[PDB]
Amino acid sequence: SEQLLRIDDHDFSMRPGFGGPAIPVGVDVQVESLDSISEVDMDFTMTLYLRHYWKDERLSFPSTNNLSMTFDGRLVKKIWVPDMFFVHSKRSFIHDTTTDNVMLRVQPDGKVLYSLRVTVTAMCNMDFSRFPLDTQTCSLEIESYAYTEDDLMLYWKKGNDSLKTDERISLSQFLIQEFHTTTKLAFYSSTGWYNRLYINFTLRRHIFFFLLQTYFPATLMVMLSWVSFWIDRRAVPARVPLGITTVLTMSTIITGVNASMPRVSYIKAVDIYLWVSFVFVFLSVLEYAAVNYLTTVQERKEQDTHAIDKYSRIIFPAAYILFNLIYWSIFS
Amino acid sequence: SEQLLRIDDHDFSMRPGFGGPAIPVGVDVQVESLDSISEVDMDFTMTLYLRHYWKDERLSFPSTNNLSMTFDGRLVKKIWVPDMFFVHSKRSFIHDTTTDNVMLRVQPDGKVLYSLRVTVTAMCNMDFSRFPLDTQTCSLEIESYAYTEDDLMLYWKKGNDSLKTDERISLSQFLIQEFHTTTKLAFYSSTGWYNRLYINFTLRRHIFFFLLQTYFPATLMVMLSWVSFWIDRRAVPARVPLGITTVLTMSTIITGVNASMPRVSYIKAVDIYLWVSFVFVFLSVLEYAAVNYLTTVQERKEQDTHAIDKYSRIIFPAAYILFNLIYWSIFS
Amino acid sequence: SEQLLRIDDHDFSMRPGFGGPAIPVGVDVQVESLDSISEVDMDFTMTLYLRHYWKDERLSFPSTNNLSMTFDGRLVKKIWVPDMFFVHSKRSFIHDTTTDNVMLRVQPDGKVLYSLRVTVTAMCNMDFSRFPLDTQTCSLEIESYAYTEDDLMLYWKKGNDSLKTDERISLSQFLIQEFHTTTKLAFYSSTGWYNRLYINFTLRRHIFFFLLQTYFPATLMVMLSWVSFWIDRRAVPARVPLGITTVLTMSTIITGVNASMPRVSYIKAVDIYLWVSFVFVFLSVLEYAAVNYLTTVQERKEQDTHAIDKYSRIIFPAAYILFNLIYWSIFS
Amino acid sequence: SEQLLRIDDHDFSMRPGFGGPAIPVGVDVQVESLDSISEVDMDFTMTLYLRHYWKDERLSFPSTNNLSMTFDGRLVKKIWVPDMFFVHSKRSFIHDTTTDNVMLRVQPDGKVLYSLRVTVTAMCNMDFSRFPLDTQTCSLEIESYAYTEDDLMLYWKKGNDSLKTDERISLSQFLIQEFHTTTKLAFYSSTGWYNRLYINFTLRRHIFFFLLQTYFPATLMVMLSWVSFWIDRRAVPARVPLGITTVLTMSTIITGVNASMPRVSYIKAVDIYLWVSFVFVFLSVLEYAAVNYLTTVQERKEQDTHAIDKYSRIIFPAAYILFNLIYWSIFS
Amino acid sequence: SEQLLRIDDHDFSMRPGFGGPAIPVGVDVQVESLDSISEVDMDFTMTLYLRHYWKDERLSFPSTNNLSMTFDGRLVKKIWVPDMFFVHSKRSFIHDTTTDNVMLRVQPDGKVLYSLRVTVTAMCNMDFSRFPLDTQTCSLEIESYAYTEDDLMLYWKKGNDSLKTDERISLSQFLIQEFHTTTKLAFYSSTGWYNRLYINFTLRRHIFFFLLQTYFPATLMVMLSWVSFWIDRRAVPARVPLGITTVLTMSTIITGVNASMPRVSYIKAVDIYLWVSFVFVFLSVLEYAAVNYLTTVQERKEQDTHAIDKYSRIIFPAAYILFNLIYWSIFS
Ligand SMILES: CCCCCCCC
Ligand SMILES: CCCCCCCC
Ligand SMILES: CCCCCCCC
Ligand SMILES: CCCCCCCC
Ligand SMILES: CCCCCCCC
Ligand SMILES: CCCCCCCC
Ligand SMILES: CCCCCCCC
Ligand SMILES: CCCCCCCC
Ligand SMILES: CCCCCCCC
Ligand SMILES: CCCCCCCC
Ligand SMILES: CCCCCCCC
Ligand SMILES: CCCCCCCC
Ligand SMILES: CCCCCCCC
Ligand SMILES: CCCCCCCC
Ligand SMILES: CCCCCCCC
Ligand SMILES: CCCCCCCC
Ligand SMILES: CCCCCCCC
Ligand SMILES: CCCCCCCC
Ligand SMILES: CCCCCCCC
Ligand SMILES: CCCCCCCC
Ligand SMILES: NC[C@@H](O)CC(=O)O
Ligand SMILES: NC[C@@H](O)CC(=O)O
Ligand SMILES: NC[C@@H](O)CC(=O)O
Ligand SMILES: NC[C@@H](O)CC(=O)O
Ligand SMILES: NC[C@@H](O)CC(=O)O
Ligand SMILES: CCCCCC
Ligand SMILES: CCCCCC
Ligand SMILES: CCCCCC
Ligand SMILES: CCCCCC
Ligand SMILES: CCCCCC
Ligand SMILES: CCCCCC
Ligand SMILES: [Cl-]
């Protein structure tokens, strides 16, 4: 094998066909798993198989079998091999247990297949201002490092059919949909033009979990705060603790929701809901102070429900309804 | 030794017997420990010994002893060795202190034994919708990377007896049961067919700890909320703070249970319990407002227990009982 | 190629032109992304491309094409290459998947271009005493390790135009502004003088998020504490729980704000706001004790609003206003 | 030196004396520090020096000095060296700054000394059911990887005197006592018999810190709940809030103790204490409801302390005392 | 250069002058930064430059220039170099981007200078029983690994002037003071005597931040608890909730201070303050129960301030004052 190929009779720092046109190289990918997601750092981790095809007649051998052979890794450092890399990546590695996950098959003609197994972490810019009703889209990019479109030609081996995805892929916090591929040509100011391949996909959440954990308790709190309009205004020590305890409860809920968020420092769509229900509960406590002050001054002036109570009984819910209509018209 | 074997007289990029049938290779495993589990990331970590057997007559030597020899590691890179790898793995390594944990024994015939010590992290899809009453099953998969069933034949060396497990294995959060092995043949669309080996096992939790930490306090809270049906309706400042303080207490408990969960964003079987006891406590606070409003309007109209109290005293517990029956009929 | 260049006919431990003047070396940078920031550890992480230019006539070759060639990495360890390093850095590495991200281009003259892809973590001293109204500025420094200004001359290749920045750069907690470059000469007491290059930039926060999360609820709490001046002093069991519950609420808010801060142990500008509103709420609770004690002793002496109430109704808000004026005059 | 020893005249893949009996190899250890402990993962980290002694007459040299020489590391890969490894370990490494921490001394006879500096993480099964009154014992195990008791003989160089421990060893959460060594022979089903060395030690906690942080406040809470037996039963709005506020306080304490525990999911000895004091506080709140209901029905029937109060004043503390006696008889 | 020095004509496994006396080697250090501190693990991280000087006439070359040359790294593995290491260290490394941060300068005589750039984590035993009023001192130790005082002599190159410290060094949680150096001779029982160098320094905190965050709110709580001595004893429903709410508030504060401490399990000087103010608040709640019981029994016996109130008004503060005097006499 090491003899079948005239390894010492050629020069492999030289791309196959240095001189005239660019070498065609064709790519095939199969995704094994998506491993983790960070919302704070804005990135994701994926593990896949990567395959390459090309022809190099320096590697042809005399056999009659019309069938391929096999090598692994050691030969990659003797021969010439392409040099793809992952664009917009934070870290990556190739697996090496119990030996290097690298495969090499060569036919009599010198046609070649070359394959690896890798894990990549790759950046994805996200926007959380519609949280928890956001949708995100991410991508993985592949490019040649050293050779430009005048020396190497990059393309998907079988067009739209060059991506395969494993059956058992899932996340404990997301739903994954819409895998597909595309291409684009890209330019560097000090080095030139290159071809680039993409893999795209889309993410969404489970909205009912967030509904019950956040929107439901605050609504029950705002509804608890309307009870005070139906209690006798003469019962001061039963109308005064109620409001302030309700404020305490709502502040506890809001604090509890703040101590578990992914810690991204700009205003999002649930913060608005929570702070508006805080303001409603606060107004309910101003109302009864108005009523008490007026009843007391009347008592002093002289020496039945109050108008403000029987008006609040109507006004407060209608305005909560009006707020909910507008809010869900804006975030749908 | 390096001379006993004609190392320079052979070609080891070539599998033993390249040409005709596939080489038989036989595997034996002993598990040392399970090291950690992640419920958020859905994976586990294990450490084991791995052993291989095969015959290669390029390694035979003239001795009369009918007994094996020993080598370590350096020789593995001179001779031909198989290339197994762990399927659906996130990371792994071989230990190297104070030197490489690799052993090699060869007999006069050329029969070989080869062994390593490794640690692997490996994915396991879990479903937590019955939490804390869930059960999970995981597995470790082993496969050849480079050679197909037409070049290498993979099997357990001794059938069901090829797995051994250490005596002192345990986790601080789980109970481990039912180790066993099996096999399956698997197919890749661009490379072909391979043999694969499995090791399976099962996990369970301690249910009484979760019972006391979560289900018990909420039940005592719902039972505390029924006390208010037996207090005099004329005692407004002693019936009004009770309910709202009880709501405060229950919200504190629920928040405390949310700040320690493994953070998996979909609805599970304990969330339902907690939110239904929240709704019961909320209804208890609506009840006394009904009673107060009615007594007040009667006082105004004119100028003994109330029916609603003596009806609630019966209705509320029966419905809590009915909820518990249905809930534990569904989750058993 | 390895032959075109007389590799074995020269000595590369020797800088080009050892002897007379210093070699000119010129630098070009393109920033890909800012990856993370730590406020506790005072540092940041960046990923970029780095490019070098120089001439070495040991690498010239006879060709007529007036056009460059290509190599990658392996050649870097055969020839002489500069040795820049990142000053005030905690950690860094060069990417190596699927092979080393290193490029090398040589023209017939022996002019050279050399480029890498790296990730660096680099220290930045920050001062948080104006938090959340702080502004920070950071920088990345580049220097030669081994050769002084008498052997190597470091400069930007194109002056102000030698820095390029990617379009899609962002952080989930900051706004980035004002990239520019400069230079400075620097001195080591036991080794001598060197040239150094800088890249500078500036950071700011989103102030409205911090406003709503911190300053707003405490203000509503201080305003809730003024309600007690308008309730009848004869209603002791409705004036005594109010203050103490309000204290409870404010302490809960402050504790909630302390359990999420970046944990830097010196006094900052929001702590002052929070503790002054604590002191206001505390004084409101001392006030009514004064009023109760005086009314009781008058009752005992003998056997209408009180002056202190109708004075507090004016004094407390004016002093809160006066505090806000001074505070926002100091932090603007 | 490299010449003094006839390196190229011998074969070092071959253990000294391959053939007849087993080589004696003798071990000496000095512990520098214990570095960290994990209670969740059940393991510890230690750093030490390790020393070996043996004789190999392939390394003898003609000198008259009767005194040893020195080498470092590079020679270890030319000659034959033993292959010990740490049994039941999760990770380890050898230090390499500013070069490899390896020492080698050889005398004229061929006697050898060989020493390293390493850090190891090693598993320790712990049982926390007596927490905070638990005691744990851990150990570090040392074994040959490749050679059995028929090829290598492992023993402590000086018996009980072969372990030394540094003066300045401590942990910020434990007290360390009782270092000693021992040996045992161990068996592998597919490879055979080996010798193994042990180092053992013991751990304990500071019990008074846990006492004040956990047992003290709950006791004061249970004692606060007995005050309600001495207040007038006619004071409903002063007897009804007291109990429920006390329940709130105790639930806050318990939640605070749950949010800081090492997160091991089975019932331990402090959980029992806390939940029994919860049940006592709950019964105190049922008591006064009984008393109120009875007084009210008597008032209705007709139209002085109550017996239940003056009985509870005696019964509740005695039963708390009886619980404490039994509890501290069981956990001592 | 590689020729100027007769590399192949000498033996470098042999220290310069093997035989007679010990080689003098002299050390110079410059500290770049202190990077982080762990109070739980008791250690710190530092980054510095390290320099060595010695003479070796195997490296002399014929030149007339009386001036030094330069090499980098590759030569270190051809020639003989010392072998210093950091004593009591947990981890360390040498920086290697964009190449190895190693410098080598040789003069015609064979005098040598050798320098590196490293980061070290190093243990420091701390005692927190005076927290937050503690002071700590730490050190970094440097020693030869392989050679004893009979083969190598270690000393500071310029005495007290051999340490330089960067201008821009700081921590976000500490103040750093008092850098200085010293030396000591040290002994190993199985290997012998060595020289060791030290760098020492001192740390302190910001005490006013801890004062306002911890001591201030508890004091205001103890002062709030004295208000109850001035309210009318006839106002039961206004004297009974006050104490218990105050207890709730103080327990919340203490829990909040426990959920952010560096988690070191022994009693410290702030714990005492907090638990004594807890006991004061608890006694204030026992007091009014005494007063109520006595007034009630007098009412029953028959059918103005109470003595206990007008005595407590004096006794409680004086004892708080007396506690503060003693406490701050003990911790100063
Ligand atoms: C499935 C639970 C839905 C809760 C909706 C609450 C809207 C305020
Ligand atoms: C919001 C509570 C209103 C209760 C009205 C009851 C009328 C029967
Ligand atoms: C960007 C608008 C924020 C509005 C916040 C309102 C809070 C009551
Ligand atoms: C928000 C309710 C206002 C009610 C005003 C009533 C004036 C008589
Ligand atoms: C062993 C404790 C069991 C608690 C059961 C509580 C069910 C509500
Ligand atoms: C998927 C059904 C959720 C029901 C939640 C009910 C909460 C009261
Ligand atoms: C859930 C209790 C309802 C009671 C209704 C009583 C109507 C008289
Ligand atoms: C957009 C919200 C602003 C809130 C300002 C609060 C100032 C106390
Ligand atoms: C701070 C509340 C004052 C209420 C006054 C109402 C006068 C109509
Ligand atoms: C450095 C001045 C701090 C002032 C704190 C005041 C808290 C009421
Ligand atoms: C801070 C308010 C003081 C009011 C004093 C009134 C004296 C009659
Ligand atoms: C040193 C404090 C001891 C506290 C004991 C409390 C027992 C309930
Ligand atoms: C538990 C409090 C009892 C108080 C009794 C006081 C008798 C003088
Ligand atoms: C294993 C016995 C647990 C008992 C728990 C009792 C809680 C009140
Ligand atoms: C739920 C408390 C009921 C109390 C009834 C007592 C009858 C003696
Ligand atoms: C636990 C106290 C029970 C008291 C019963 C009294 C019956 C008259
Ligand atoms: C600068 C604030 C000092 C606070 C001192 C509090 C002492 C109890
Ligand atoms: C601790 C509050 C005492 C108030 C006394 C007021 C005397 C005018
Ligand atoms: C070591 C003495 C501890 C004293 C604790 C006192 C708590 C009230
Ligand atoms: C701690 C205050 C004690 C007061 C005792 C008064 C006895 C008449
Ligand atoms: N294809 C990536 C190259 O352009 C790298 C660089 O920017 O120099
Ligand atoms: N056995 C694994 C191989 O099929 C790898 C690949 O997918 O190319
Ligand atoms: N340019 C950095 C050199 O001065 C390194 C050192 O301080 O020795
Ligand atoms: N001494 C350890 C060996 O037995 C390794 C193995 O289990 O193969
Ligand atoms: N100078 C350190 C040496 O003594 C290492 C050892 O303890 O063997
Ligand atoms: C917040 C409600 C105020 C009503 C004044 C009449
Ligand atoms: C929630 C109970 C309402 C009862 C109305 C009669
Ligand atoms: C804190 C207010 C005190 C007023 C005394 C007249
Ligand atoms: C929980 C105490 C009940 C007493 C009934 C007489
Ligand atoms: C009044 C009796 C009290 C008994 C306490 C043990
Ligand atoms: C705790 C104070 C008790 C006073 C008894 C007279
Ligand atoms: Cl009342």
mmCIF file of N, CA, C and O in Angstrom, chain A residues 1 32 49 51 74 97-98 101 105 116-117 166 168 170 172-173 206 212-213 227 238 245-246 249, chain B residues 13 40 77 84-85 88-89 92 125 141 145-146 188 190-191 194 236 240 244 248 258 263 265 275:
data_model
loop_
_atom_site.group_PDB
_atom_site.id
_atom_site.type_symbol
_atom_site.label_atom_id
_atom_site.label_comp_id
_atom_site.label_asym_id
_atom_site.label_seq_id
_atom_site.Cartn_x
_atom_site.Cartn_y
_atom_site.Cartn_z
ATOM 1 N N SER A 1 0.828 -1.204 0.000
ATOM 2 C CA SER A 1 0.000 0.000 0.000
ATOM 3 C C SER A 1 0.863 1.254 0.000
ATOM 4 O O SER A 1 0.762 2.071 -0.916
ATOM 5 N N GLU A 32 -25.173 14.236 13.580
ATOM 6 C CA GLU A 32 -25.457 13.272 14.634
ATOM 7 C C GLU A 32 -26.325 13.858 15.751
ATOM 8 O O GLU A 32 -27.325 13.247 16.142
ATOM 9 N N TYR A 49 -20.626 14.246 11.028
ATOM 10 C CA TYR A 49 -19.655 13.632 10.137
ATOM 11 C C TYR A 49 -19.484 14.516 8.907
ATOM 12 O O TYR A 49 -20.454 15.103 8.417
ATOM 13 N N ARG A 51 -17.521 14.733 4.979
ATOM 14 C CA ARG A 51 -16.956 13.903 3.923
ATOM 15 C C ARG A 51 -16.536 14.766 2.742
ATOM 16 O O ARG A 51 -17.186 15.768 2.430
ATOM 17 N N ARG A 74 -2.717 8.281 9.555
ATOM 18 C CA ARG A 74 -1.282 8.387 9.310
ATOM 19 C C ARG A 74 -0.988 8.830 7.887
ATOM 20 O O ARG A 74 -0.044 9.590 7.649
ATOM 21 N N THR A 97 -10.611 8.577 20.216
ATOM 22 C CA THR A 97 -10.681 7.377 21.045
ATOM 23 C C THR A 97 -11.570 6.339 20.370
ATOM 24 O O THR A 97 -12.689 6.661 19.954
ATOM 25 N N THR A 98 -11.074 5.100 20.256
ATOM 26 C CA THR A 98 -9.745 4.736 20.787
ATOM 27 C C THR A 98 -8.578 5.077 19.865
ATOM 28 O O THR A 98 -7.419 4.914 20.244
ATOM 29 N N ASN A 101 -10.624 9.303 14.687
ATOM 30 C CA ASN A 101 -11.812 9.038 13.875
ATOM 31 C C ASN A 101 -11.611 9.621 12.477
ATOM 32 O O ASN A 101 -12.236 10.603 12.069
ATOM 33 N N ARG A 105 -10.400 6.318 1.792
ATOM 34 C CA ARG A 105 -10.572 5.271 0.793
ATOM 35 C C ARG A 105 -10.109 5.770 -0.567
ATOM 36 O O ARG A 105 -10.468 6.875 -0.984
ATOM 37 N N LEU A 116 -14.272 12.511 8.570
ATOM 38 C CA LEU A 116 -13.888 12.862 9.935
ATOM 39 C C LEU A 116 -15.121 12.908 10.827
ATOM 40 O O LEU A 116 -16.257 12.895 10.348
ATOM 41 N N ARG A 117 -14.888 12.993 12.138
ATOM 42 C CA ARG A 117 -15.964 13.166 13.107
ATOM 43 C C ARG A 117 -15.576 14.279 14.069
ATOM 44 O O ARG A 117 -14.527 14.198 14.719
ATOM 45 N N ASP A 166 -29.965 12.835 11.868
ATOM 46 C CA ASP A 166 -30.298 11.649 12.637
ATOM 47 C C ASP A 166 -31.720 11.715 13.192
ATOM 48 O O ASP A 166 -32.319 12.784 13.345
ATOM 49 N N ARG A 168 -32.939 10.757 16.136
ATOM 50 C CA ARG A 168 -33.122 10.822 17.582
ATOM 51 C C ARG A 168 -32.579 12.129 18.162
ATOM 52 O O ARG A 168 -31.949 12.145 19.222
ATOM 53 N N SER A 170 -32.936 16.020 19.652
ATOM 54 C CA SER A 170 -33.897 16.704 20.504
ATOM 55 C C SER A 170 -33.152 17.579 21.498
ATOM 56 O O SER A 170 -31.964 17.379 21.763
ATOM 57 N N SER A 172 -33.966 19.582 25.468
ATOM 58 C CA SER A 172 -34.856 19.636 26.614
ATOM 59 C C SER A 172 -35.447 21.016 26.836
ATOM 60 O O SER A 172 -36.050 21.260 27.886
ATOM 61 N N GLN A 173 -35.252 21.938 25.900
ATOM 62 C CA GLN A 173 -35.765 23.291 26.053
ATOM 63 C C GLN A 173 -36.231 23.916 24.745
ATOM 64 O O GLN A 173 -36.612 25.090 24.750
ATOM 65 N N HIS A 206 -41.694 26.038 24.061
ATOM 66 C CA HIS A 206 -43.006 25.601 24.537
ATOM 67 C C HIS A 206 -43.647 26.781 25.263
ATOM 68 O O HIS A 206 -43.192 27.179 26.337
ATOM 69 N N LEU A 212 -48.411 29.357 32.190
ATOM 70 C CA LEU A 212 -48.648 28.993 33.563
ATOM 71 C C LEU A 212 -47.580 29.495 34.579
ATOM 72 O O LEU A 212 -47.973 29.899 35.660
ATOM 73 N N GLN A 213 -46.266 29.487 34.243
ATOM 74 C CA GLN A 213 -45.324 29.883 35.286
ATOM 75 C C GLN A 213 -45.302 31.390 35.526
ATOM 76 O O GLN A 213 -44.958 31.824 36.632
ATOM 77 N N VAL A 227 -61.188 42.425 45.019
ATOM 78 C CA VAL A 227 -62.067 42.041 46.117
ATOM 79 C C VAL A 227 -62.274 43.198 47.078
ATOM 80 O O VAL A 227 -63.323 43.284 47.724
ATOM 81 N N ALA A 238 -59.605 45.717 58.344
ATOM 82 C CA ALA A 238 -59.698 44.606 57.410
ATOM 83 C C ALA A 238 -59.535 45.035 55.963
ATOM 84 O O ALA A 238 -59.321 44.183 55.099
ATOM 85 N N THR A 245 -50.517 43.549 51.934
ATOM 86 C CA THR A 245 -50.079 42.161 51.843
ATOM 87 C C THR A 245 -50.055 41.714 50.387
ATOM 88 O O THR A 245 -49.178 40.940 49.972
ATOM 89 N N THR A 246 -51.042 42.178 49.611
ATOM 90 C CA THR A 246 -51.127 41.857 48.193
ATOM 91 C C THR A 246 -49.914 42.411 47.450
ATOM 92 O O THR A 246 -49.334 41.732 46.592
ATOM 93 N N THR A 249 -47.010 40.136 48.158
ATOM 94 C CA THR A 249 -47.112 38.902 47.380
ATOM 95 C C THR A 249 -46.650 39.118 45.942
ATOM 96 O O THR A 249 -45.868 38.321 45.396
ATOM 97 N N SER B 13 -0.377 -1.354 7.417
ATOM 98 C CA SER B 13 -1.482 -0.483 7.049
ATOM 99 C C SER B 13 -2.506 -1.448 6.501
ATOM 100 O O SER B 13 -3.645 -1.071 6.269
ATOM 101 N N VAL B 40 -30.123 18.162 32.579
ATOM 102 C CA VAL B 40 -30.298 19.269 31.644
ATOM 103 C C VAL B 40 -29.725 18.907 30.278
ATOM 104 O O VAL B 40 -30.387 19.065 29.244
ATOM 105 N N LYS B 77 1.719 1.472 17.892
ATOM 106 C CA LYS B 77 1.892 2.334 16.735
ATOM 107 C C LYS B 77 2.838 1.729 15.704
ATOM 108 O O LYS B 77 2.974 2.281 14.604
ATOM 109 N N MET B 84 -11.950 0.726 17.105
ATOM 110 C CA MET B 84 -13.311 0.886 17.604
ATOM 111 C C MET B 84 -13.518 2.295 18.152
ATOM 112 O O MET B 84 -12.567 2.992 18.518
ATOM 113 N N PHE B 85 -14.780 2.719 18.208
ATOM 114 C CA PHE B 85 -15.079 4.050 18.710
ATOM 115 C C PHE B 85 -16.467 4.011 19.329
ATOM 116 O O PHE B 85 -17.264 3.110 19.060
ATOM 117 N N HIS B 88 -22.427 7.951 19.491
ATOM 118 C CA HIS B 88 -23.262 8.893 20.248
ATOM 119 C C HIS B 88 -22.576 9.326 21.540
ATOM 120 O O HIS B 88 -23.151 9.259 22.626
ATOM 121 N N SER B 89 -21.338 9.785 21.415
ATOM 122 C CA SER B 89 -20.530 10.209 22.544
ATOM 123 C C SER B 89 -20.191 11.686 22.397
ATOM 124 O O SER B 89 -20.036 12.196 21.285
ATOM 125 N N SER B 92 -14.332 11.846 25.370
ATOM 126 C CA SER B 92 -13.680 10.662 25.910
ATOM 127 C C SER B 92 -12.172 10.864 25.838
ATOM 128 O O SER B 92 -11.674 11.745 25.132
ATOM 129 N N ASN B 125 -31.313 10.136 25.733
ATOM 130 C CA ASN B 125 -32.533 10.932 25.698
ATOM 131 C C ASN B 125 -33.472 10.525 26.829
ATOM 132 O O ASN B 125 -33.784 9.343 27.006
ATOM 133 N N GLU B 141 -22.812 2.426 23.146
ATOM 134 C CA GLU B 141 -22.700 1.755 21.859
ATOM 135 C C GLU B 141 -21.252 1.749 21.388
ATOM 136 O O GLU B 141 -20.518 2.723 21.588
ATOM 137 N N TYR B 145 -14.906 2.086 13.128
ATOM 138 C CA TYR B 145 -15.056 3.314 12.355
ATOM 139 C C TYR B 145 -14.835 3.086 10.862
ATOM 140 O O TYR B 145 -15.636 3.535 10.035
ATOM 141 N N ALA B 146 -13.759 2.388 10.500
ATOM 142 C CA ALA B 146 -13.224 2.451 9.144
ATOM 143 C C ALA B 146 -13.580 1.236 8.290
ATOM 144 O O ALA B 146 -13.614 1.352 7.059
ATOM 145 N N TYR B 188 -25.046 2.989 7.016
ATOM 146 C CA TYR B 188 -24.778 4.373 6.647
ATOM 147 C C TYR B 188 -24.951 4.534 5.143
ATOM 148 O O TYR B 188 -24.473 3.707 4.360
ATOM 149 N N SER B 190 -23.811 6.641 2.842
ATOM 150 C CA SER B 190 -22.676 6.873 1.962
ATOM 151 C C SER B 190 -21.489 5.962 2.252
ATOM 152 O O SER B 190 -20.489 6.034 1.529
ATOM 153 N N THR B 191 -21.564 5.089 3.270
ATOM 154 C CA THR B 191 -20.424 4.201 3.500
ATOM 155 C C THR B 191 -20.767 2.722 3.652
ATOM 156 O O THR B 191 -19.927 1.890 3.293
ATOM 157 N N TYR B 194 -22.329 -1.924 9.153
ATOM 158 C CA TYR B 194 -21.407 -2.192 10.250
ATOM 159 C C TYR B 194 -22.131 -2.952 11.353
ATOM 160 O O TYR B 194 -23.356 -2.891 11.474
ATOM 161 N N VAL B 236 -64.427 39.985 61.091
ATOM 162 C CA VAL B 236 -63.855 40.370 59.802
ATOM 163 C C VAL B 236 -62.338 40.513 59.908
ATOM 164 O O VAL B 236 -61.614 39.873 59.120
ATOM 165 N N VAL B 240 -60.073 38.001 57.338
ATOM 166 C CA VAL B 240 -59.586 38.609 56.097
ATOM 167 C C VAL B 240 -58.070 38.450 55.981
ATOM 168 O O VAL B 240 -57.582 38.107 54.894
ATOM 169 N N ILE B 244 -55.257 35.790 52.958
ATOM 170 C CA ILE B 244 -54.233 36.403 52.123
ATOM 171 C C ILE B 244 -52.841 35.993 52.605
ATOM 172 O O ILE B 244 -51.931 35.787 51.787
ATOM 173 N N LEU B 248 -49.881 34.050 50.509
ATOM 174 C CA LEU B 248 -48.467 34.419 50.536
ATOM 175 C C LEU B 248 -47.580 33.203 50.800
ATOM 176 O O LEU B 248 -46.568 32.986 50.119
ATOM 177 N N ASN B 258 -39.470 26.101 42.593
ATOM 178 C CA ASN B 258 -39.067 26.392 41.219
ATOM 179 C C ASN B 258 -37.586 26.754 41.094
ATOM 180 O O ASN B 258 -36.998 26.575 40.021
ATOM 181 N N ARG B 263 -34.434 22.570 35.501
ATOM 182 C CA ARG B 263 -34.584 23.649 34.513
ATOM 183 C C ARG B 263 -34.876 23.114 33.113
ATOM 184 O O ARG B 263 -34.170 23.409 32.145
ATOM 185 N N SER B 265 -37.853 22.985 30.282
ATOM 186 C CA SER B 265 -38.975 23.899 30.082
ATOM 187 C C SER B 265 -40.150 23.209 29.393
ATOM 188 O O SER B 265 -40.530 23.531 28.268
ATOM 189 N N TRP B 275 -50.166 23.774 41.282
ATOM 190 C CA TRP B 275 -51.046 24.833 40.796
ATOM 191 C C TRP B 275 -52.508 24.554 41.149
ATOM 192 O O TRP B 275 -53.281 25.498 41.362
#
